[PDB]
Scaffold this active site. Structure first.
Site, PDB file in Angstrom:
ATOM      1  N   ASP A  45       0.836  -1.195   0.000  1.00 13.01           N
ATOM      2  CA  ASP A  45       0.000   0.000   0.000  1.00 13.01           C
ATOM      3  C   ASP A  45       0.876   1.253   0.000  1.00 13.01           C
ATOM      4  OD1 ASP A  45      -2.259   1.621   0.128  1.00 13.01           O
ATOM      5  OD2 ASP A  45      -2.727   1.159   2.213  1.00 13.01           O
TER       6      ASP A  45
ATOM      7  N   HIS B 233       3.663   3.762  -8.879  1.00 20.12           N
ATOM      8  CA  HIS B 233       3.556   2.314  -9.079  1.00 20.12           C
ATOM      9  C   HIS B 233       4.834   1.691  -9.638  1.00 20.12           C
ATOM     10  CE1 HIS B 233      -0.524   1.550  -7.789  1.00 20.12           C
ATOM     11  NE2 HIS B 233      -0.952   2.589  -8.483  1.00 20.12           N
TER      12      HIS B 233
ATOM     13  N   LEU C  66      13.125 -18.959  -3.527  1.00 23.50           N
ATOM     14  CA  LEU C  66      11.930 -18.282  -3.031  1.00 23.50           C
ATOM     15  C   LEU C  66      10.807 -18.352  -4.054  1.00 23.50           C
ATOM     16  CD1 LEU C  66      10.747 -16.228  -0.816  1.00 23.50           C
ATOM     17  CD2 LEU C  66      11.482 -14.452  -2.428  1.00 23.50           C
TER      18      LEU C  66
END
Ligand SMILES: CC(C)Oc1ccc(CN(CCC(N)=O)C(=O)c2cnn(Cc3ccccc3)c2-c2ccc3sccc3c2)cc1
Lengths: 230, 225
Positions: free
Chosen positions: A12, A29, A121
């Site tokens: 956020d 963004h 990962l």
């Protein structure tokens, strides 16, 4: 080894971060993708097995946000995925596929297919994802199998339901986040992994997502390790 | 600013509260009921419509002492709540509870069923995942019997099969979830219903949680806009 196996992250603050710089919301963004790249990398070498990330915000104009969210995979495949493939990271998505633009469904499947043999990962993208939707979606599947006689109404258990959720594709001991991180000062979950995160530790920070880096991650991991002491 | 309609509360820190004051654990749970009495009356006065309270390996004696509190609560606390127009209801698996406890639960419910003020909603033998599992179970049983189509499966449907179904439709989801005694985790409490709730975390131990604490949570909630 003092590292949470699965970290949930609610990314956020991209919009707020951009407005602070006198720059448009798109600029915010792109920095968020850089943040993600740094965090994904940093988490990989630290020993984290899975991260589920979630592009959510309430600083809207939904069409706009539901516009540059679906646009993420496209841009992310071009400029960021190659390096994550080099770092042995496996990419997967959770969420609903039906209502996706072709070009963004192409970028996601290509991102998955590039990285499917990778053993490091697992970067899990929660795109077009809602927790209650996930469970409802799982309920449809289960209910139809009860009519097909594949299972009994008695056979429906917490363990079974886990296998029908979007996180089923992950290994069974890693499906549930040990920690969930939210940025931008908002103290709420916004429908992120309600089932899987039921027992998770929570870390809230005022730091905006694009300023969230390896140092911020470790600080969150330090907080987590401190909870175990209490 | 104005009051959240449905507040969820995870009651924690009874043990530690007693430890600081060099008393047994049984007294910590006693002071926790006083805390609950204060909060329920206070919440009712401020105009809260619903509070969902969650009580959550002890000694073998302790469970015997904890088993006596529901009866005590009915004798020395419920009457006052009934006088203040509070309605007592439960969510969770009541069929697992002892007789003397289930019968005290039912008496509190039957005594207050006609009441129109705040709904004191006890979360007892409750687990979020277990609740949802129960919901998807009863729904699948209704699908078998042809009472429901598989295409009628929706978020709202599932909501109608959660333990929180007995609350009025507009007040089923908590607006605010409070966690006391310093822990930053939701402990399987209303995962579905609380998916969008504002979370509030305080170091205050549950027995110290009073109107000041409540109003500080309510004020914090309004600063979220
Ligand atoms: C009957 C109904 C109207 O009130 C009930 C509600 C729940 C339960 C379930 N209960 C008891 C467990 C068991 N032995 O069954 C717990 O979960 C539990 C574990 N610690 N504490 C202490 C505590 C007290 C106060 C605050 C926190 C913890 C409680 C607890 C919780 C609330 C209240 S209110 C009257 C007694 C009581 C006991 C049974 C009855």
């Amino acid at each position: 080894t003092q590292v949470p196996a699965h970290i949930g992250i609610i990314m956020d603050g991209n919009g707020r971060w951009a407005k602070k710089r006198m720059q448009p919301r798109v600029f915010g963004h792109k920095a968020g993708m850089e943040a993600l790249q740094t965090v994904t990398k940093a988490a990989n070498k630290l020993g984290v097995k899975v991260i589920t990330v979630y592009a959510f915000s309430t600083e809207n104009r939904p069409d706009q946000e539901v516009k540059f969210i679906m646009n993420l995979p496209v841009e992310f495949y071009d400029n960021y995925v190659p390096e994550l493939h080099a770092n042995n990271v496996k990419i997967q998505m959770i969420g609903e596929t039906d209502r996706l633009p072709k070009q963004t469904f192409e970028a996601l499947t290509k991102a998955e297919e590039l990285t499917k043999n990778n053993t490091g990962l697992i970067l899990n993208f929660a795109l077009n994802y809602g927790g209650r939707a996930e469970i409802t979606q799982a309920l449809k599947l289960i209910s139809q199998d009860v009519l097909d006689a594949k299972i009994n109404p008695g056979d429906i258990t917490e363990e079974l339901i886990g296998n029908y959720l979007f996180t089923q594709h992950l290994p069974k001991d890693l499906r549930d986040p040990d920690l969930i991180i939210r940025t931008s000062g908002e103290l709420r979950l916004s429908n992120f992994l309600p089932w899987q995160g039921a027992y998770s530790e929570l870390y809230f920070t005022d730091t905006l997502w694009p300023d969230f880096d390896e140092a911020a991650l470790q600080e969150a991991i330090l907080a987590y390790n401190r909870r175990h002491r209490r």
